[PDB]
Amino acid sequence: DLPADYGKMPAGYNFLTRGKDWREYDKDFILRTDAVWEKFQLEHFFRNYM
Amino acid sequence: AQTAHQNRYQGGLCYAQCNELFSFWNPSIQQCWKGCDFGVGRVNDPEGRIEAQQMCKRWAAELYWTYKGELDTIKDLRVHADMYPTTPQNVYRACLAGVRRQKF
Amino acid sequence: FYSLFNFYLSRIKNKNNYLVRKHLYTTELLIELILFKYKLIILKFSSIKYILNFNVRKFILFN
Amino acid sequence: VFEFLFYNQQHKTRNGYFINHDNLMLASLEERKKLIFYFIANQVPEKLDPVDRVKFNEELSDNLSTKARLIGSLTGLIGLVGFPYISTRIYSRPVLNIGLSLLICPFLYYVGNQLTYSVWEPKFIANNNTVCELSKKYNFTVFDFAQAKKEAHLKALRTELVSDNLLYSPGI
Amino acid sequence: MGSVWFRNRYWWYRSLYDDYVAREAKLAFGIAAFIWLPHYYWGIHLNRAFEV
Amino acid sequence: VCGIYVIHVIYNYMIPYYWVSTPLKNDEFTRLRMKDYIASTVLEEVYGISYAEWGWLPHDFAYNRMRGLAGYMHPDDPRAMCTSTFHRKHKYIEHEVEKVGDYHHMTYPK
Amino acid sequence: ALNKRNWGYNAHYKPELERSMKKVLYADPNYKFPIEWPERYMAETKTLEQVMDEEENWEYYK
Amino acid sequence: ALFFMANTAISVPSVLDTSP
Amino acid sequence: IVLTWGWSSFQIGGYNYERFDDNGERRNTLYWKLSPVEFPQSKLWNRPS
Amino acid sequence: VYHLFERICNPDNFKLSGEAARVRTLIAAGFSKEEAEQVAWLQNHQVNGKILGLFTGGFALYCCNNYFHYFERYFPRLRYQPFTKFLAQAATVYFFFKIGDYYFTSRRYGSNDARMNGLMYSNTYYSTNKEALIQNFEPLNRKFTEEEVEQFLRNEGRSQEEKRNWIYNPHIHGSTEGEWKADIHEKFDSGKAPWEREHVKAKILETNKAKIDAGEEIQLKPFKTLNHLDKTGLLHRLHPFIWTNNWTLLG
Amino acid sequence: MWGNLWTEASYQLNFNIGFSSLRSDVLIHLAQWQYWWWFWFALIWSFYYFIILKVARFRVLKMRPKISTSYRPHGKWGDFLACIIPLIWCINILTNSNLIL
Amino acid sequence: SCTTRRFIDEKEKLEYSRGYNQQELEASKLRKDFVKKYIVDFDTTLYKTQVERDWAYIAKREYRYEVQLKSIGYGGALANAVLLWRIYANKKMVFWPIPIVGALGYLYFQPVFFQKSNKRFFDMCNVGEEYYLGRERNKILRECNKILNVEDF
Amino acid sequence: ARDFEYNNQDVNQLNGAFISLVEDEKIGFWVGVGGFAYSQFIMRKFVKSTNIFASVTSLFAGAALANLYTHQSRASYARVAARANRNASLALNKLMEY
Amino acid sequence: SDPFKKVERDYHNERSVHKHFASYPLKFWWGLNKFETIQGIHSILGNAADLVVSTLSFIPGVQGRNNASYIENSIRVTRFRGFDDKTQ
Ligand SMILES: CCCCCCCCCCCCCCCCCC(=O)OC[C@H](COP(=O)([O-])OCC(O)COP(=O)([O-])OC[C@@H](COC(=O)CCCCCCCCCCCCCCCCC)OC(=O)CCCCCCCCCCCCCCCCC)OC(=O)CCCCCCCCCCCCCCCCC
Ligand SMILES: CCCCCCCCCCCCCCCCCC(=O)OC[C@H](COP(=O)([O-])OCC(O)COP(=O)([O-])OC[C@@H](COC(=O)CCCCCCCCCCCCCCCCC)OC(=O)CCCCCCCCCCCCCCCCC)OC(=O)CCCCCCCCCCCCCCCCC
Ligand SMILES: CCCCCCCCCCCCCCCCCC(=O)OC[C@H](COP(=O)([O-])OCC[N+](C)(C)C)OC(=O)CCCCCCCCCCCCCCCCC
Ligand SMILES: CCCCCCCCCCCCCCCCCC(=O)OC[C@H](COP(=O)([O-])OCC[N+](C)(C)C)OC(=O)CCCCCCCCCCCCCCCCC
Ligand SMILES: CCCCCCCCCCCCCCCCCC(=O)OC[C@H](COP(=O)([O-])OCC[N+](C)(C)C)OC(=O)CCCCCCCCCCCCCCCCC
Ligand SMILES: CCCCCCCCCCCCCCCCCC(=O)OC[C@H](COP(=O)([O-])OCC[N+](C)(C)C)OC(=O)CCCCCCCCCCCCCCCCC
Ligand SMILES: COC1=C(OC)C(=O)C(C/C=C(\C)CC/C=C(\C)CC/C=C(\C)CC/C=C(/C)CC/C=C(/C)CC/C=C(\C)CC/C=C(\C)CCC=C(C)C)=C(C)C1=O
Ligand SMILES: CCCCCCCCCCCCCCCCCC(=O)OC[C@H](COP(=O)(O)OCCN)OC(=O)CCCCCCCCCCCCCCCCC
Ligand SMILES: CCCCCCCCCCCCCCCCCC(=O)OC[C@H](COP(=O)(O)OCCN)OC(=O)CCCCCCCCCCCCCCCCC
Ligand SMILES: CCCCCCCCCCCCCCCC(=O)OC[C@H](COP(=O)(O)O)OC(=O)CCCCCCCCCCCCCCC
Incomplete structure (x- = not known):
């Protein structure tokens, strides 16, 4: 059951993730087999375009 | 151009009522047609009718620059034949008129 | 495979000897084929109504 | 001259495809459960777990399906007896003999398979320990039977629709 | 495909021009049935290039 | 055909030009817009969008659809009133819009 | 009913992640957006100081 | 016109975004 | 002179041009999805322009 | 003999059978009245091409059987082998059959234009219905749970014409009034299907x-053929033919 | 050259025959229209080939002159029938032109 | 992309002339079986999502041009050569070789062209793991990568 | 566990029709056997025809005789079962509709 | 063999072609069940086979049909009930 205050910002909350474990978010996104190639193409295009 | 039908005859009685409401050269008929499209499937519901009216406010806001409170402070919401869509209030009033004319 | 083997056997038997009594089943099949050919000729050269009347009369005579 | 020639008809008198509510109404509780399970296993195996599917398929092949196939093959061989049917030392009439075999043998196969099913399917359904145990385990209901019947008819329709095109079908 | 639809074919020729070029017109169909294929197929490739 | 076309041009473009020639005290804009409507909304340069697929390919049609909506966004435009709607899918094949009217913005077709 | 369409009105975020808190907040009947959709595209009239004061005094519904 | 282009390549689909 | 050369010369040329010259494509580009398309030959040089 | 007389002289024999036979058979099979109608229409459309092709082939043979004799000029095999002529006639009949089947069953993709939809210039309606059915058909691979069966039994007597007045009796319903009202609203008034409940899914x-x-x-939700088959094409947003309809679909 | 982004739109060579650039949507439509304009001439071109061939082979006095006994023409609607082809040309021009406009 | 298409075609030609080893042949067989089952011998229109239906057809259409049409041309060319031989031998027109030899040529040339361009057809089906076709595509890719002890996109 | 219960009236009507049909089929098997035997006897003694043709004719005569005997119960049970199936299908679809 | 693979559910396998062209000429005979005479012939043959099995049931391992059981009678009687060739 919800804590009756779900979505409430905790007092003094700071938008930091210095010591967060990112391994829990792996199943929330899907990357294609050519992610590495896309990464280089994205860098190449941005450098030569912007 | 921005309505839901390729010609005004495809539109039902609401388009015909829009033509009757305004003069033949008055381009507020198109805004009335937009009100008809917004009111399709909503006029026969108490919450739907309010939703269609809110759709008119957004439609007027996106067409013309407007401030917060102008549409709420409109004095008369009635429309005459020679009312043209030169201001958000006229567009909003025309859009509301089409929603009222819409039957289904 | 079966068709090839049986065709070869039939050809060999026919070319070797032919004055041998054959099986009743095969003889009846050949009789039926010949009668079917004759009946096809009759139907081609006769009317369906006439065929029906003749068959009805023959059946009545048989009864 | 009509559908009975160019439409699928081999699934309408086998594998319990003819089981409907009329049998279930007169059937007792245990017999109703057995009939529903048999129909579901034959027509919509997806409702069964893989182990149950394999076991039921093996039992069906052993008892009814493969047995009927074997009997139909035997009847087809009986038809093939005497081949070539008409021939002589001059001509062999290969095309005529092939046509006669094509017309006669599959008819005998179908007759034998239908006879095997009509004879053994009721006995298999009534007096099969595996079918009884699995029916008791699953305990299907009338709602399940109706859903299975609709799904089986939809499956037959889908098979016919997919088989509609078999020579040329680019897709667009 | 032209004069055949008319039951007064002499009128068909007289009423159009009073000239007779039917022989060449009806012979041209055979050549015209295949002279366009290379153009049509290349156009399909060209249309796809525009679509891409 | 030319004579009929010329007569239509005269009816729309020549005679109405003389109706108003001086400033008008009452409803000047309404009276000026009355005579302008018949000339600016002729079907010669309005009709065609209903059959836009004759020249616009599916992907071209989608790009032109958003171009047209932006171009004819001004509410005070009798020509846009008489123009066929841009809120429709290519009759052959649509690649961007799945349902007509299911947008994320009342003006942008996407 | 068949011809009913939203026409790009109130096209707010539609969360897809199962554990996103938006998927529950928007499902809550008593959820108030920061600004109404029609007003989200209209020019602001209040002065900067007034806007800051209103936001400071703003209280979450829960 | 009606079929002046004589062909339409409806097969060519909208390019699918492949960004990570 | 009249029919077969004029109705096939351009298409032959365009097909060969694509075969050996990549329809005149300028290489050294990135992400063909975003790059513009170099169209094959479309202006009939055999037909008087 | 009385039953034989009944069979011979039944007025149903003289009465021409209609297309309701398919609907009745489907209803007996288990499909609903609307689902039965849609499936019957799909089957009729599928078989009409074959029937028309067979009729056309028969008519063509009955008319131009003399062409087989005429072609003996170039193919004396027909003249000197009647079996060849019979095979040629069967091939012609099969060719007409295939033409009809292609016309009425092949995809024959076409535009979704109200100006020509339903004219059979393209097999759009049949193609779309077949594709939707095949894509979205997935047999229910479950066993209806006890809660689902109980809900189906309890649904007896429900009617959308008038909502039932639910009355709370603590001695037979248990729980608290508010919880029971919420549960009842979820079960019946809300229209939520039994399989959508979290505990049912678990x-x-x-x-x-x-x-x-x-x-x-x-598959939690059983397949609903009425939600994917529509002979009118409105479900798939196929624009109705203009001249036979007085309304328009947005698309 | 705005950076590595080559913004040049025209790369026509010394003996260019086509449009200078094909990036513009207007020129693409014109290029596609012109290509298909030439396509719809198969029957006409073949017809003119045969009449040219016939006249050059048999209509000379040497081969097969014909006694033209016709006094006056009698055409009444050949002009209307012939004008279908230019009519289609006008329709194609109007349709393509208007869509661009 | 015409430059890419030419490069891919030339790469396949060089590889075919080079030959294949045990590992490459095994990987090719897996790709060829996957493509035939999911693309060539399946109605692409029966998939769920529009994206996979469109891209699956693009792969199917590409296969038809690069294998079926090419094989028919090569098969016909062989049949025509035999037809010319028989015509000269018999000093008349013979029609039997056209069907029979054309079918034999198509059966001979289809496997070689399929082997030549098996990788291209397999790669074009990488719609994404979110779809059934892409998921099966990824599964075969992992198996091929394991067999070849390399990584491919 | 509770389960859908069919209409008792339909169940009783089906029971009667089923009993009648079972009895009629049991009698009709022997009726057809006797008809086949009689037709074979007549063909072999009075009709000059092929043995295979005579056997086929006798089998068809026996089948026709059995069908004539058993048609009434077959048709009655068929119609009763069809009506029961339609009623049950409609009731179940109404219950499960969502 | 591996019947597990065949049993396993697959989208492509389920939606693929199961009946090919060659099967139609070899299986069109099953449509003869529409005819009452054919149904009667099949019923007679099945009853004769059942009688033979019952007579030979004296040997161990063979069991004939028992009229007491409802299922056997129901199946044997409703095999051809409601047959319709026009509905798939
Ligand atoms: C200068 C140098 C440089 C040049 C530069 C390039 C050029 C620039 C030029 C620019 C200027 C352009 C000017 C253009 C205008 C020019 C006009 C001019 O000078 O000419 C005047 C010239 C004057 O007329 P004409 O051409 O002399 O008139 C004669 C007709 O044209 C002739 O036609 P016809 O019909 O009278 O005669 C033929 C007739 C001959 O036949 C008969 O008459 C016989 C009766 C018919 C029946 C026959 C069959 C019977 C069979 C019996 C059974 C057999 C045994 C069984 C075997 C089978 C079964 C076993 O054939 C038929 O009618 C039957 C044909 C049937 C085929 C169609 C059926 C299709 C479906 C079949 C399917 C089969 C496959 C199934 C597959 C299924 C699955 C895929 O043309 C005009 O009239 C002006 C036309 C202007 C344009 C409008 C066009 C439409 C109007 C009609 C005319 C169309 C044709 C002619 C067009 C002109 C070009 C060819
Ligand atoms: C040696 C050989 C070796 C060979 C080796 C190689 C072997 C190779 C392998 C071969 C394997 C082959 C295996 C398969 C072979 C067997 C297949 C099979 O089952 O076939 C037998 C198949 C068995 O049928 P069934 O399933 O037992 O019949 C159902 C029972 O009738 C059940 O029906 P129901 O009783 O519930 O209702 C009908 C009622 C009778 O109630 C009626 O009145 C029915 C009326 C229906 C509508 C009539 C409309 C007529 C107007 C024109 C059409 C209008 C459009 C609508 C048409 C709707 C369809 C009828 O019938 C009765 O109760 C009659 C008493 C029964 C005992 C008498 C039996 C007579 C024959 C059965 C047909 C009788 C039809 C009579 C029609 C009316 C005459 C007054 O028999 C037939 O096909 C029927 C008999 C043959 C008719 C031949 C017609 C030839 C053309 C005549 C043209 C000229 C006249 C046209 C006008 C009509 C006359 C006025
Ligand atoms: C005897 C047969 C009689 C047939 C009946 C029709 C012919 C009647 C006699 C000739 C006059 C025809 C006038 C038609 C148009 C009238 C209205 C009008 O101009 O506005 C609509 C349209 C103008 O539309 P618009 O753009 O002004 O649209 C107005 C509406 N808003 C503002 C919302 C856009 O007219 C035209 O477009 C005229 C173009 C010029 C050419 C017209 C040719 C018409 C077709 C040929 C007819 C030939 C008849 C020959 C008869 C004798 C020989 C047989
Ligand atoms: C009554 C008179 C009516 C006159 C009508 C007006 C006619 C106008 C057109 C006249 C054309 C004359 C023929 C031109 C042939 C050009 C061939 C050519 O270069 O290929 C073009 C085309 C161009 O191919 P391409 O691949 O080079 O493409 C052009 C270049 N790129 C690639 C950059 C686009 O090639 C072909 O057609 C290839 C096959 C040619 C086969 C035939 C060769 C014939 C050679 C000349 C004739 C034989 C020599 C002796 C002649 C003696 C005469 C007495
Ligand atoms: C070896 C010595 C030979 C001596 C020579 C004479 C031999 C005579 C042999 C007679 C054999 C009779 C066998 C009957 C078998 C019945 C089978 C059966 O179940 O049938 C039920 C059917 C009736 O079916 P039903 O559907 O009404 O009812 C079924 C029965 N219940 C309801 C109880 C379940 O009876 C028939 O129709 C049988 C006859 C069929 C047609 C052939 C008739 C031939 C004789 C015609 C004589 C006409 C005389 C003139 C009449 C003038 C009238 C104005
Ligand atoms: C009352 C006014 C008419 C009704 C409203 C329509 C008017 C606007 C459109 C008319 C022109 C359409 C042209 C389309 C492009 C094709 C051009 C073309 O092929 O021209 C070269 C052709 C001849 O050139 P060709 O010889 O190259 O033809 C092509 C040859 N093959 C296919 C071998 C490559 O000229 C014509 O005769 C074309 C006539 C138009 C096309 C008709 C096809 C049959 C369809 C039914 C027509 C019924 C009449 C009404 C029109 C149909 C819609 C209602
Ligand atoms: C489908 O097919 C078709 C097409 O597609 C290919 C078409 O495009 C077309 C459209 C085509 C047309 C409308 C026609 C286009 C034009 C055509 C065919 C003709 C073009 C001809 C040329 C380009 C040739 C160039 C012309 C010339 C005159 C060259 C002459 C050459 C030479 C070597 C002569 C040089 C001599 C001199 C300069 C003079 C020297 C001598 C003297 C001064 C005098 C000497 C005197 C003494 C005494 C010594 C058609 C019809 C078609 O059917
Ligand atoms: C009035 C009485 C007749 C009424 C019905 C008339 C039907 C006409 C159509 C052809 C009928 C052929 C004989 C009966 C076949 C019955 C089974 C059948 O039709 O199966 C279907 C199949 C063709 O179906 P198709 O549309 O291609 O596939 C779609 C599948 N979804 O079938 C076939 O492919 C079979 C036919 C293939 C083509 C054969 C051409 C030559 C003729 C061969 C006849 C058989 C040999 C006979 C030899 C001995 C007798 C002479
Ligand atoms: C099944 C496997 C076993 C082997 C069989 C294979 C069957 C293959 C598929 C069907 C083949 C059909 C052709 C059969 C042989 C040729 C029949 C024939 O002669 O047909 C032409 C005939 C014209 O008659 P004609 O003698 O020329 O009369 C001249 C009048 N001036 O006209 C006719 O008589 C009409 C022929 C119609 C053919 C069938 C057309 C399809 C629809 C049939 C509907 C039912 C017709 C019932 C007719 C009953 C007649 C008693
Ligand atoms: C030296 C000693 C050698 C002894 C050899 C003995 C061989 C015995 C087996 C023979 C072949 C049996 C095949 C069984 C196929 C089968 O049932 O395969 C299984 C399938 C199952 O399909 P169904 O589920 O519809 O029954 O059967 C069919 O599809 C039936 C098709 C028709 C079969 C007719 C058989 C007739 C007799 C043989 C001739 C066939 C002609 C075919 C057309 C030209």
């Missing part, structure tokens, strides 16, 4: 864990 998953381990997906 029980389904627990029961079918073996299939989940084997890698088979469990």
